[PDB]
Amino acid sequence: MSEEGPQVKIREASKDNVDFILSNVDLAMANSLRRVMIAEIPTLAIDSVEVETNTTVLADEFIAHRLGLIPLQSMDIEQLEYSRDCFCEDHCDKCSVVLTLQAFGESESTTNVYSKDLVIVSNLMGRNIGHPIIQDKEGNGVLICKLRKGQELKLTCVAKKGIAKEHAKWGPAAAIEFEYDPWNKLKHTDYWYEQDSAKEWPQSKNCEYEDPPNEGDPFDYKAQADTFYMNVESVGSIPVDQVVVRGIDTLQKKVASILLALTQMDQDKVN
Amino acid sequence: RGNLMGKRVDFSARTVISGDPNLELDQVGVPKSIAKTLTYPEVVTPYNIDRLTQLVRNGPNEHPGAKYVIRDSGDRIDLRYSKRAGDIQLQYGWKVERHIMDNDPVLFNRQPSLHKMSMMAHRVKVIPYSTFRLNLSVTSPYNADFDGDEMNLHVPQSEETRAELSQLCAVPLQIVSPQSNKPCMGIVQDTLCGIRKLTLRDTFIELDQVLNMLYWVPDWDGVIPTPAIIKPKPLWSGKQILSVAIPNGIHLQRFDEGTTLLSPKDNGMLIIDGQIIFGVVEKKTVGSSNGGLIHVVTREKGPQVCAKLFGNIQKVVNFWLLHNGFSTGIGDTIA
Amino acid sequence: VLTCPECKVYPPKIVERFSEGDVVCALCGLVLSDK
Amino acid sequence: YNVRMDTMANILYYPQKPLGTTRAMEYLKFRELPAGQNAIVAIACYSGYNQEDSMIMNQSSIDRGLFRSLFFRSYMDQEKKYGMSITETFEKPQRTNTLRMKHGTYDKLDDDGLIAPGVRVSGEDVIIGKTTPISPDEEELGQRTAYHSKRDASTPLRSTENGIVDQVLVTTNQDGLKFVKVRVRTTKIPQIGDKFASRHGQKGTIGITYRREDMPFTAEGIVPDLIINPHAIPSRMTVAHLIECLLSKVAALSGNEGDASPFTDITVEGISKLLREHGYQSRGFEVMYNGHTGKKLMAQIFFGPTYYQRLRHMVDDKIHARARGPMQVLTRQPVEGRSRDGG
Amino acid sequence: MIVPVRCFSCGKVVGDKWESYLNLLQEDELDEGTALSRLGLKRYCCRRMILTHVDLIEKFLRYNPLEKRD
Amino acid sequence: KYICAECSSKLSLSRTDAVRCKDCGHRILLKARTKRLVQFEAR
Amino acid sequence: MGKSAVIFVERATPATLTELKDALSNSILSVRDPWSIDFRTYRCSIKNLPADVSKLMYSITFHHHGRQTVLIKDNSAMVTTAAAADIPPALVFNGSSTGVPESIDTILSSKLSNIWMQRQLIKGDAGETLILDGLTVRLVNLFSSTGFKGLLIELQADEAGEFETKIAGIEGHLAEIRAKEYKTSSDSLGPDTSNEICDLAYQYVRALEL
Amino acid sequence: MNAPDRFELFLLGEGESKLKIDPDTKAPNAVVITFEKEDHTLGNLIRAELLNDRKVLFAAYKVEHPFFARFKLRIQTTEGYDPKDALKNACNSIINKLGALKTNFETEWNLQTLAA
Amino acid sequence: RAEGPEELARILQQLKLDKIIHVLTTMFENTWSCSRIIKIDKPIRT
Amino acid sequence: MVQQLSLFGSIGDDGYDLLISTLTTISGNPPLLYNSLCTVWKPNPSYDVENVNSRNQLVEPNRIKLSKEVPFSYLIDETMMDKPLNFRILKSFTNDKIPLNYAMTRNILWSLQISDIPAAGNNRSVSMQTIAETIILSSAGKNSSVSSLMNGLGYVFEFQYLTIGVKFFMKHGLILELQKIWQIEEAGNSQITSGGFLLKAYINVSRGTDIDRINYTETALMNLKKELQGYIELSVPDRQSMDSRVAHGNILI
């Protein structure tokens, strides 16, 4: 086992949540890891809509914005290309996905337009991608709109590849909890009290994983932050372990890009 | 009273304001489109014909660029319709009506203009979005806040006019007001709330933060102050880091109620050759008061040095306060 | 009658820029009448 | 609001009924047609971009649809009947037999002279085609040619308005003349320079927007939808803002409407007791970490939901610039009016 | 106005749960807090999304875009 | 093409025909959306 | 007659170039000056086109071969120069040329911009060239607008007798470094007419296509 | 509207160098390195790693305005040692640490799946 | 273009050294494949 | 790309011989024979270029010139090998007939060149024109030919002509040309410059921004013109005649 490197202890896992401890690591590294896990992991989402028939009570960009946030399966996103790089005109077969939506309110009672009715008509080339993410029991997923008697909606959707640094729709992580030093041994926070600070502030669940300090011990002025407690939840598109692994990979690639540029510049200086 | 004493004018804009702590004291953020609409007639000379040629080639739909070309004879060519963005050859004495570029003087005011200090000059910086930007210390002479106020921008169109705006009406030259012979600007609001929490005897700083703070001061000389507690752990006191912003050669003495030459309440202020000996800094020191730090700095060094001082102090104290934190709640009104 | 003194093309092609208070020939870009 | 062709109209995408409601609201029907949203607010100092009534906002929140409003506008026109002959006609003008045509694109007009619903109009385009017959004895001092038998009377859009035509209506007035009404739609999104207000006289403008990474966070991964400055509390003595924050937080954590009517028995200590049942510091403080470096913050932060309303003043309707342009007939000085690009 | 698909604060998705949330309120006759916690809404921001929603889509739907009076 | 305002009947009107509905006889007539969807770029 | 081949690796790593440089270090005889290459694609902006007429035009700029541009369309090549030292003296003498021409890329992107518009640009800078026994190998990292794209290898030899063996050897050398997805090409544009730089540009186009 | 495009946060413009190195004129063996299209995520990590080298004297970074994605780094090292070499060592150490972290997480996740 | 007496002495020492190196390298090549690529960080102890 | 500063004129063939001698008296150099062949190509009308920004006029369509040198073995008939290859052969080139016919030029199918209308204003003493130039070295492929190349770009053939004349090189890079132009069609060959020689004196400037050099060039050209006063009148041609855009058709010949 790699005893010279960062250590990890998973305590809990599921389809959505991973709950773990990260030890023997700096604070800067853990912070950068969480920043990348939230902001810089690609995913597949709807990026353009064109509408044929709209006899609803809502607007057009309203429904466009509603569609732009629906989650879709993006496990194999490494085999697509940024549409600004593909040589195709407009959208490719290798640099986009295409879906169609059609609905009509034939019945007297109002009819809901969910996200289970998005149908893919492009060619996937045997890649696991484009499927809508469904997490409810009934399987309907995100409800999109509402229809009455004699109302129809027809439109076509183009979904592309990007990151969360340009829109919140491509983000695969909902919210990640990041804690450390629940006993305030390092004196990083200073408490606010009325009578007794030790009682007004509740205790974190994490206190059980460290030993309380003793009043006879002088302030330890040599310690550093080393143990962090994280919890990560996914929107649903990517598996959560893949979220963590891809965050690490993206950080590695960024540092490697820095290294390559530095080597190139050193070769230039040689000239 | 409506067409001969005051009248509508050209080359002007009007927009809401906002606050920017990263801008210098005498610098204003101008939106991109407002910079694309107003112009300036620069004269083609041997020193600028290359940049001016590239500007004409750029066209009117790109910043920087140009919008019209005036010949020697008074004829004016619209660059948009004339395909000759890549064709017109410029000569000596022609004029290019170019966009407004960084470090162009402008006049800036708020209505009603009750006194002299409500109409001041600024240097432009082209920014995105639709608001104007101001340093948070000029909002006192303007009597302006950021809940919906709109101010007016006027552009000079010559060299004599530009020199007048740069040597007479500049913000640095309007600090000691002549109505009550005392400073009209100072550290205000949350920078003032922070520069006091920093200089208590309680506040000590580790190594990394001292390094970042010393980098933030743009006038640093690369020397790391020797700490005050060398052993058993190197630490820095807030007074020590804040002394870096203050120039060298500044001396200040202030004795408050019941303060001796060894202050037990940490009252008064002693500054010897740029170093804070003892004393917390607060409204009586870095505010708009007589005999404070701002007044002595202006009367000893000059307006430009005090203008630098405003931004040095703001940068250091805001960087520290970003990591300290501050709030207020209902628990502070309970007894 | 308003004609460009450099293109010398009849009938003259002219566009009025109302938002700038100008009259501009659509070929050489020359400004004919202002305000 | 769907039918009515009002001169102007604003609509909010998602309205939320407040968490703290007075008992009287049940008669003004404010829980049926609200006028704001519950925004998580953290009262703090953070980077110095919210001083003197400015505020800082979370950009991911903006992107997900918070405070996004539809905008609706309308225009009208009708054929005028001078004397006994109809002096105005609704037909697409042609450059062969027309003079004083406008620089706008006539291409989007149909054969009827009226644009059709669903076309992205833009600056200075025309949506109604109106032609005026002119008597032969009327000549524009030599401007008119032999074949210019008609004049243009079209109505271009306002110079800045952009969007999608939403409806077109054709009717007749009392005199039997034709009558056309056009309604146009647009979408407005908050940005640096807008205007927001709470229910206690505390209003401000957006001064900068941050993304979820630079936002300070709590140990539970919660992020403030906006951040205001605490230098606004003392001189205004708006203790009701703080009490509303506390009670709304307790109601959100609990799940029931919290009374806030005047002259009643609710006290601050009671709601603080009800707060500690859930597991938070009683005076509403919380521990928050820095967004950039990830450290702890020395001072705790007052944190909780509130109610905010998006006011009527947008920076897009106040911005104006002018280099040159039209003058006045009599005094020959730059005209008055922003929509008429004046000085 | 139909329920927001996502939470404005923590990025979570609440759009699909509205239909099932309405079920617990009258079929099971539960209170609002327990019903909100029954669907995994634990941060109070998601509870804010679901709890304070005014569903205006059932009023426009009894209506047409043609002929409102005043 | 056009459409009625009460019954939304499908009607076609010339440049000289009276602005009325044939079945209900009302004086309020609405247009019809562009049948051919047209793509655009917001600039 | 010299022969050339081009191999493009799409799934390469940033350090793969160093790995292949060291794995061949036993046979490396010498090293020479670095090189660069540019690769543009231009698109046709006219819609009234026949079905059989192609829409793209690939421009490849060689920096080491004396600053020369090659335009490729439908297996048709065109070679343009821009240096004053490459001008045939007859054109200078008779007056058919002013003597200081411009690159064809400026012409396409300045004067004919209403027929052709740029669509992408792929660049390669600071490549390394190594002399092995009767062989010259050039390596470079390809950078698009977004970032790193892949690895490019071009091989040139003077004697065409054992070219295939050398290609197989280099393929095996890549094989031990576990670079298994690589696309190679050594085709010739014209069986009867042999121009070296045109064939090199065609091989580049065939390797770099998606 | 004056809102700049978002893709200017992660796509370099043409003619843009991802790194720019400039000698510092005040302190010997000091360099200022400008990074483009980057934010605190990278600068904090690199500075925290550069603070572990016993031959590195000074290492500090800043992001002057939160509108533009770029930041400055400043390095000063001991005599007979190049700041670029220090940067290279820091990047190598960071990469090794991240690789070890990834291997550990994969091992733990697979063990949990076996225990799942 | 040399500037210092120490520089001149170093230049002459290098002249003798690389003259000998060239002589022996020519001797080897006229009979042997040298390597002009390998650079060792630390000189080999004598 | 160059700024070409030019002056024009014409002469009758009667004085031709005399003129030549005078030039050698001034320059100190002998004339050198030359020839060329130019083909003009225009954008294809079958393709609708909607990309011309009609509301802004960012650009207008223009015509492309392809030039090549042709050996004299195609221009000398069976009666002329006896005479040496010098300038005097031009004295026999007065007939509208010429050995090079349409079929040979069709069999031929370089320097690519584009230009713009000269600079406006009436304060210009010499014709200043902007030229963008490139060179085609070779080609390959299944349809390697100039015609196929220009059809690939989107251009089609319009006409062609043949220039024959003499060149004089003077100091400061000044070039003086005496030309005779033969238009060529399947119908036959017609000499437009009938019974005369077209005279053109010009200089090239590499960078248009440098203005000291341009002033020097204008000084040299006006000094040359003032030297030839009384013999030949060198004049600035019509600005509207040197316009080569497709929308309007005329050709200075």
Curated annotation (Swiss-Prot), chain A:
Keywords per UniProt: Acetylation, DNA-directed RNA polymerase, Metal-binding, Nucleus, Transcription, Zinc
GO process terms (BP): RNA-templated transcription; termination of RNA polymerase II transcription; transcription by RNA polymerase II; transcription elongation by RNA polymerase II; transcription initiation at RNA polymerase II promoter
Cell compartment(s), UniProt: Nucleus
InterPro entries: DNA-dir_RNA_pol_30-40kDasu_CS, DNA-dir_RNA_pol_insert, DNA-dir_RNA_pol_RpoA/D/Rpb3, RBP11-like, RNAP_Rpo3/Rpb3/RPAC1, RNApol_insert_sf, Rpo3/RPB3_RNA_Pol_subunit
Record's keyword annotation contains Nuclease: no
PROSITE patterns cross-referenced by the UniProt entry: RNA_POL_D_30KD
Major place of residence: nucleus
UniProt modified residues of type N-acetylserine: S2
GO terms for cellular component: nucleoplasm; nucleus; RNA polymerase II, core complex
Domain of life, per lineage: Eukaryota
Residues engaged in binding Zn(2+): C86, C88, C92, C95
A GO molecular-function descriptor: DNA-directed RNA polymerase activity
Description of how the protein assembles with itself and partners: Component of the RNA polymerase II (Pol II) complex consisting of 12 subunits.
Misc: Present with 10000 molecules/cell in log phase SD medium.
Family recorded in the similarity comment: Belongs to the archaeal Rpo3/eukaryotic RPB3 RNA polymerase subunit family.
Name the UniProt record assigns to this protein: DNA-directed RNA polymerase II subunit RPB3
Species this protein is from: Saccharomyces cerevisiae (strain ATCC 204508 / S288c)
Gene name as annotated: RPB3
From Swiss-Prot, chain B:
Superkingdom, taxonomy of origin: Eukaryota
Residues reported to bind Mg(2+) 1: D145, D147, D149
Residues the entry annotates as binding Mg(2+) 2: D145, D147
PTM remark: The tandem 7 residues repeats in the C-terminal domain (CTD) can be highly phosphorylated. The phosphorylation activates Pol II. Phosphorylation occurs mainly at residues 'Ser-2' and 'Ser-5' of the heptapeptide repeat. The phosphorylated form of Pol II appears to carry, on average, one phosphate per repeat. The phosphorylation state is believed to result from the balanced action of site-specific CTD kinases and phosphatases, and a 'CTD code' that specifies the position of Pol II within the transcription cycle has been proposed.
Disulfide cysteine pairs (residue numbers): none
Signal peptide bounds: none
Cellular compartments annotated: Nucleus
UniProt family annotation: Belongs to the RNA polymerase beta' chain family.
Other notes: Mutagenesis experiments demonstrate that the minimum viable CTD contains eight consensus Y-S-P-T-S-P-[A-S-N-G] heptapeptide repeats. Identical and simultaneous substitutions in a number of consecutive repeats are lethal: 'Ser-2' -> 'Ala-2' (14 repeats), 'Ser-5' -> 'Ala-5' (15 repeats), '2-Ser-Pro-Thr-Ser-5'-> '2-Ala-Pro-Thr-Ala-5' (10 repeats), 'Ser-2'-> 'Glu-2' (15 repeats), 'Ser-5' -> 'Glu-5' (12 repeats), '2-Ser-Pro-3' -> '2-Pro-Ser-3' (15 repeats) and 'Tyr-1' -> 'Phe-1' (12 repeats).
Protein's name in the database: DNA-directed RNA polymerase II subunit RPB1
Organism field: Saccharomyces cerevisiae (strain ATCC 204508 / S288c) (Baker's yeast)
Gene name tied to this protein: RPO21
Curated annotation (Swiss-Prot), chain E:
Keywords (A to Z) from UniProt: DNA-directed RNA polymerase, Isopeptide bond, Metal-binding, Nucleus, Ribosome biogenesis, Transcription, Ubl conjugation, Zinc
Major subcellular location class: nucleus
Family designation: Belongs to the archaeal Rpo10/eukaryotic RPB10 RNA polymerase subunit family.
Coiled coil ranges: none
A biological process term (GO) from this entry: transcription initiation at RNA polymerase III promoter
Domain of life, source organism: Eukaryota
Biological function: DNA-dependent RNA polymerases catalyze the transcription of DNA into RNA using the four ribonucleoside triphosphates as substrates. Common component of RNA polymerases I, II and III which synthesize ribosomal RNA precursors, mRNA precursors and many functional non-coding RNAs, and a small RNAs, such as 5S rRNA and tRNAs, respectively. Pol II is the central component of the basal RNA polymerase II transcription machinery. Pols are composed of mobile elements that move relative to each other. In Pol II, RBP10 is part of the core element with the central large cleft.
Compartment annotation: Nucleus, Nucleolus
Additional record remark: Present with 5300 molecules/cell in log phase SD medium.
Protein name: DNA-directed RNA polymerases I, II, and III subunit RPABC5
Binding annotation for Zn(2+): C7, C10, C45, C46
From Swiss-Prot, chain F:
Entry annotated with the keyword Protein biosynthesis: no
Modifications after synthesis and translation: The N-terminus is blocked.
GO molecular function, one term: DNA binding
Lineage: superkingdom: Eukaryota
This protein's record includes keyword Secreted: no
Record GO biological process: nucleolar large rRNA transcription by RNA polymerase I; ribosome biogenesis; RNA-templated transcription; termination of RNA polymerase I transcription; termination of RNA polymerase III transcription; transcription by RNA polymerase I; transcription by RNA polymerase II; transcription by RNA polymerase III
Keywords: DNA-directed RNA polymerase, Metal-binding, Nucleus, Peroxisome, Ribosome biogenesis, Transcription, Zinc, Zinc-finger
A cellular component annotation (GO) from this entry: RNA polymerase II, core complex
Protein localization: Nucleus, Nucleolus; Peroxisome
Ligand binding (Zn(2+)): C4, C7, C21, C24
Zinc finger residue extent: C4-type: 4-24
Further remarks about this protein from its record: Present with 907 molecules/cell in log phase SD medium.
Subunit relationships: Component of the RNA polymerase I (Pol I), RNA polymerase II (Pol II) and RNA polymerase III (Pol III) complexes. Component of the RNA polymerase I (Pol I) complex consisting of 14 subunits: RPA135, RPA190, RPC40, RPA14, RPB5, RPO26, RPA43, RPB8, RPA12, RPB10, RPC19, RPC10, RPA49 and RPA34. The complex is composed of a horseshoe-shaped core containing ten subunits (RPA135, RPA190, RPB5, RPO26, RPB8, RPB10, RPC10, RPA12, RPC19 and RPC40) where RPA135 and RPA190 form the DNA-binding cleft.
Family according to the record: Belongs to the archaeal Rpo12/eukaryotic RPC10 RNA polymerase subunit family.
Protein name (database record): DNA-directed RNA polymerases I, II, and III subunit RPABC4
